[PDB]
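Thread: Modeling a multi-component assembly for a lab meeting

Hi all, long-time lurker, first post. My supervisor asked me to bring a structural picture of a complex we are working on to next week's group meeting, and I have zero experience with this. I have the sequence lines for every component (468 residues in total). Could someone generate the structure of the whole assembly? Inputs are pasted exactly as I received them:
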Amino acid sequence: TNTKGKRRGTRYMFSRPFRKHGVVPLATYMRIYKKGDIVDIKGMGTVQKGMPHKCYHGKTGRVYNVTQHAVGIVVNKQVKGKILAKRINVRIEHIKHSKSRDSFLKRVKENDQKKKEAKEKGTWVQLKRQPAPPREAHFVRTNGKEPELLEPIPYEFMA
Amino acid sequence: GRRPARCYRYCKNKPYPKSRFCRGVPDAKIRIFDLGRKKAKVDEFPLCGHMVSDEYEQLSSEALEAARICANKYMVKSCGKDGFHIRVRLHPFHVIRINKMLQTGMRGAFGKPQGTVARVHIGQVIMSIRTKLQNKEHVVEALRRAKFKFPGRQKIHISKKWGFTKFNADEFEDMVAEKRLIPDGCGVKYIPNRGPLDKWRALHS
Amino acid sequence: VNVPKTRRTFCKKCGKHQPHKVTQYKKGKDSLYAQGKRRYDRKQSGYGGQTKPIFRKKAKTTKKIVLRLECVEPNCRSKRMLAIKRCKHFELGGDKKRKGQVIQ
RNA sequence: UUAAUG
RNA sequence: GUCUACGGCCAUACCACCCUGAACGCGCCCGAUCUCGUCUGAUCUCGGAAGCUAAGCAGGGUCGGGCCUGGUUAGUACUUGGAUGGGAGACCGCCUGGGAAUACCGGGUGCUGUAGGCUU
RNA sequence: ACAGUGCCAGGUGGGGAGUUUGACUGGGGCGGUACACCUGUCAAACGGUAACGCAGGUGUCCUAAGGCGAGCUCAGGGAGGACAGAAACCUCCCGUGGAGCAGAAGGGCAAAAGCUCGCUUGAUCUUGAUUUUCAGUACGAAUACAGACCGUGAAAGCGGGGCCUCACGAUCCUUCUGACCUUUUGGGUUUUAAGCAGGAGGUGUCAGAAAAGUUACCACAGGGAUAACUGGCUUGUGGCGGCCAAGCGUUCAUAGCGACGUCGCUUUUUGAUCCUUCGAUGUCGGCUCUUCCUAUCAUUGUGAAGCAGAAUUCACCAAGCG
RNA sequence: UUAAUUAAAACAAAGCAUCGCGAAGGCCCGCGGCGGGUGUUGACGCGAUGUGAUUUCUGCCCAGUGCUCUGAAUGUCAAAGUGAAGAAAUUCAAUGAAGCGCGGGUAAACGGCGGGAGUAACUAUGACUCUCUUAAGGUAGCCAAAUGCCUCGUCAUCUAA
RNA sequence: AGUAGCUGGUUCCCUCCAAAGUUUCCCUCAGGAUAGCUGGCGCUCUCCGCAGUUUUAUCCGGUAAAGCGAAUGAUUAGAGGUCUUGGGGCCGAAACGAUCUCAACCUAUUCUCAAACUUUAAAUGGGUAAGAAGCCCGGCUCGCUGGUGUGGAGCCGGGCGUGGAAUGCGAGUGCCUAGUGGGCCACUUUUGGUAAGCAGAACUGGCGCUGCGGGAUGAACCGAACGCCGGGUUAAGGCGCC
RNA sequence: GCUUCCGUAGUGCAGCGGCUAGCACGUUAGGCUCAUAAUCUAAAGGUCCUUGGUUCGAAACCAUCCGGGGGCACCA
RNA sequence: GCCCGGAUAGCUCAGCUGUAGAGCAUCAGACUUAAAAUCUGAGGGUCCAGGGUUCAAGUCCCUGUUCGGGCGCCA
Ligand SMILES: [Mg+2]
Ligand SMILES: [Mg+2]
Ligand SMILES: [Mg+2]
Ligand SMILES: [Mg+2]
Ligand SMILES: [Mg+2]
Ligand SMILES: [Mg+2]
Ligand SMILES: [Mg+2]
Ligand SMILES: [Mg+2]
Ligand SMILES: [Mg+2]
Ligand SMILES: [Mg+2]
Ligand SMILES: [Mg+2]
Ligand SMILES: [Mg+2]
Ligand SMILES: [Mg+2]
Ligand SMILES: [Mg+2]
Ligand SMILES: [Mg+2]
Ligand SMILES: [Mg+2]
Ligand SMILES: [Mg+2]
Ligand SMILES: [Mg+2]
Ligand SMILES: [Mg+2]
Ligand SMILES: [Mg+2]
Ligand SMILES: [Mg+2]
Ligand SMILES: [Mg+2]
Ligand SMILES: [Mg+2]
Ligand SMILES: [Mg+2]
Ligand SMILES: [Mg+2]
Ligand SMILES: [Mg+2]
Ligand SMILES: [Mg+2]
Ligand SMILES: [Mg+2]
Ligand SMILES: [Mg+2]
Ligand SMILES: [Mg+2]
Ligand SMILES: [Mg+2]
Ligand SMILES: [Mg+2]
Ligand SMILES: [Mg+2]
Ligand SMILES: [Mg+2]
Ligand SMILES: [Mg+2]
Ligand SMILES: [Mg+2]
Ligand SMILES: [Mg+2]
Ligand SMILES: [Mg+2]
Ligand SMILES: [Mg+2]
Ligand SMILES: [Mg+2]
Ligand SMILES: [Mg+2]
Ligand SMILES: [Zn+2]
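Re: Modeling a multi-component assembly
Sure thing. I ran the full set together rather than chain by chain. Output:
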């Protein structure tokens, strides 16, 4: 059977990328973490204190507690019958912001601007995202030259 | 002696080479991988023919040795001792195992290293003979006699390249004339326009 | 391992860091009038043989050494136990080693 | 006390 | 146009050689009384300003190496799902989407935040 | 007045009594621990993932190899310099780590996490929360905080053991420590004892019985979940047949053989597995007796010889008769 | 002698060699007794053994496990008794039997009783010589035996084989 | 009427629902406990929520492939070098003086690889978001942090409904709880083994628990799942006769 | 095959990481002897089986390799 | 765990708080023609390690580390 260690099979995962070893960048340290921000988790092997677990590498949760040099985050772990919203304490190095919340906030701000606009006008402009439709009919202009006749190539052995 | 090649004919396992973990491997029979006149230039052996496999199988080092001797004898009988250059382009690294039964049985069954074998893909060159342009059917005959030492099926293809190079024969003379290629023994040196100008002046001076 | 005989550390009754004389801890003598000892003597007294089990499968070869830290201050004189990981060789304040010397 | 051979 | 001090992203910023630096600056430089530290004022610290761009440094160049970004490799290798497809097998072909990486050939060679100068 | 008897106490005591003689296991036994943990891989790019799958490691060690702060840069290579040389000491240049961080491996680390100095004991006390193993229970390990006392640094801060992933142990009993702590029984004092809290003495079969064999004199309840014999799949091995042709055959690859290699058939051998059978399928030989196969020893008919005759080899139709 | 699968090489047997006991004893039975069997006995006896007629012998070893002897010269050693301070429960000290250790014997007690090299003037064998080790290293006899894997050992005889 | 974790048996009908041979622990491996699957009893709402699904954005990888003119471990062969050194000589007393070399070394190449190598790097996949529990305002409290009615958190009082992707479906929640804890087979990936109707894994579906048409035969294959019947039509398979 | 052990001058042995490897014999040289022996005095001689690792240092400790020697090989 | 013995020069053993002794061994002088046999002097003591009492300790006292000899066995 396999061993049940903390860092079993984490050869490539906590390893730093190529030519990205050395001193940890400091904007990652000084970037502030508010409560209730959607946060993805990516481990780092330089700072060994406050590492998450290999099941939480790649997972995304949100911050409930903030301490001096670490924050707590409620992530969703699927354990053998069900998904549990469980909380882990992660140091600053293993934490980035998720922009999936940021794109949604930009879309909410755009929808609020488009809702305040055209209210006294009366034009009904669509606010919902409509998916990629069947495209409209169009005219392919084959001006000048005729289309090039594609001939399938005969077989010839290169090796 | 040892087992027939019907056992380890096909690629069954992962590639398992001789390394720090796999130690105690006996030495393979094939060690001299080229012969003929290897102390030669690219200009004096234009023609090149390859033995290209057509099966994803495992060719043994002893079969490589037997086919090398079988090609060597016909090339010495036909083209002389210094009129050809044979090159085996399959180095056997896959260490293959043996489960010898003297009674334990299948319990604790992991093989001791039996021998070496070469992992062969479809469309991969087994042997390659470069020679003069007059000796074409002789190289076809030598590779045809060397096909019988291997299992499976492989084809004989005379290449469009100039010997053991990656450049075509109709373009090779023009590139040597415009000094883009230098004869450097068996291989060739390709000079781009990417280097410094002192190399260009050393070439054209 | 090597530990010193003088350790300045926290004190329970005082509340500050004070020095402590450090000695090793050994098991005291078993009292005949303890409750389980009286129960074992009454249970063994009579016919029946050995009633309670006798442990025999001793596996590990070393013990957890315990330091008995007595306070140096004469008014307090408080003591407590301190647990350290298992070690075979052990001594108190002997041969404080140097750096970069001739080994003969 | 030891002291064999040609 | 550019520098100094503190920085962000950490090679488009690195490395080898060559050329030019007006002004402020940055430095090289002059000494050990005091603060300080060494075998040694070489480092560190202190007190300065005779000389200098020689060097660091700044800018630029090399059919430069590296690095970054594209084409080619190539719809190639590979791969989700499918078949009463093939073949003795090995493996291969097709339907349905997705889709690389070497060699090779182009381009580029730091942007920027705060404060304070210089070219008055 | 001792043998002796009655009762205690110590020794001896399979003469006798009771009981035990672990587990996994390509049957069991022997051998190993795959029984408690850790690294790389298997593992199929979140996680999880098995075999007596592979390579290994552990029950330690450290008064520093823990915690700060400062200063240096390592391994290696080149050039040199009295003894001095492949190697003793010094200097210069290059040197992204090719050294070191105690160990097995992996990750990480350059004005450091390495080396050397200066001071210390955050390897101290106390609640709670969380991760890992997981049933979402413990133990062990760790993660952020909080309340105090502290160390270092000028300070920011760092530190409540080891740069991270392993180095360890329930109830019951015993021992030590702590509170001007509780009970010790009708009340009061003092020993003693029982409590509460924190360590320690251990169960390695590591969620933890106190445990030697033999039975061919054996027994019982079961199992084809499991061996010994037949039949199954498979064919390493045993036997048999082809392909290529370096050579043997005075001359000549193939009359007859045939290396180096390679492709197949058979269940007349041994293996491999455990599918059938343990509410029984009688275990090896020999005697007798019937039938079948050809991979043909002889006989019928034929082709080739290194077939002059004879004798003998190779191949075909061929199992009728021996 | 295994009644009902083994009539034998097994058991027994005489011969041989041991051990204990002089009776308040040796061996043994019995819940118990001033109990009982040997014993209506007394070392030419009883009880416990091993081997197995006659002839010839009975090699060496007490390292190990047994058995046995000797004992204030004595390390340990329980209960009882003695001293001790405490208010007492008490703990401490001294004294301290048998048996264990210490010191001899015993192998017709259980049992056990080697290895590697060189060496004779053709070659082998090698008497002989060197070395390591135990408590000696298997002596006299015997043997491919009922005992020998290799083994259907080698030679001769018995056979055509 | 000793015990048995071990065999054998266990007595009427219909209807409805419907499994598992798996996690962890146990002197545990023929057995239990505990989760998981199952049934029953309900309750709280409806006439917003949820999804074995896709899309739009946004993070993760280190497998397939590829690479050794990039690191590590290998590994094959020719070129050009200089004294960086040396084995044999040669003309030298000797001399980096000269000389043909042959060896290691250096520089540009070249052939073949790696489950325990990797600069790159897929397909499939795994998280998160796609709004009322959300924005925009105004003000109080704090013993926390603080050049600064600074920052953060918690309270209030209002204003915004175009239910802020596609499609589909009524949802949430609490007890009691049997049986199971021997599995097997199949496209693909893959460990050991020469291979096995062999042993052991990953995804998913079947058999077990399941009838029916076909494969002559048949626990697993293809189609397709089942109340009792009539008309029609197909799938998979076939259409000489049976 | 499994578990275990050994491998040191010429020969048989020892050896507690830090030696000049130790004892005996053999060998050679010198005395004694008429010679020989024995005896006496001197001396030579170890690839520490091989590779690697730990170590400041390895004949030993750790790993593998090549030699060698015993114990097991089982009921059916 | 309790009790009692020893650990001292290369080796075996004594040692009553005030140059550590006896024997074997080595070296150096006699003897013999010479070794060996036998005399003579000399050298060699971490008194197991540390602490305490005393003016002074190998000795007295505990604390630990090795080595026997017997007892005792509820995690
Ligand atoms: Mg395999
Ligand atoms: Mg009693
Ligand atoms: Mg100066
Ligand atoms: Mg300058
Ligand atoms: Mg300049
Ligand atoms: Mg460039
Ligand atoms: Mg008894
Ligand atoms: Mg008994
Ligand atoms: Mg068993
Ligand atoms: Mg996956
Ligand atoms: Mg520092
Ligand atoms: Mg450290
Ligand atoms: Mg604190
Ligand atoms: Mg009372
Ligand atoms: Mg028997
Ligand atoms: Mg019997
Ligand atoms: Mg079966
Ligand atoms: Mg059979
Ligand atoms: Mg065969
Ligand atoms: Mg010939
Ligand atoms: Mg099975
Ligand atoms: Mg029958
Ligand atoms: Mg025939
Ligand atoms: Mg009978
Ligand atoms: Mg009879
Ligand atoms: Mg006798
Ligand atoms: Mg005798
Ligand atoms: Mg005796
Ligand atoms: Mg004899
Ligand atoms: Mg059972
Ligand atoms: Mg991986
Ligand atoms: Mg690959
Ligand atoms: Mg069952
Ligand atoms: Mg099971
Ligand atoms: Mg299987
Ligand atoms: Mg079903
Ligand atoms: Mg069905
Ligand atoms: Mg059929
Ligand atoms: Mg289908
Ligand atoms: Mg119908
Ligand atoms: Mg039909
Ligand atoms: Zn105190």
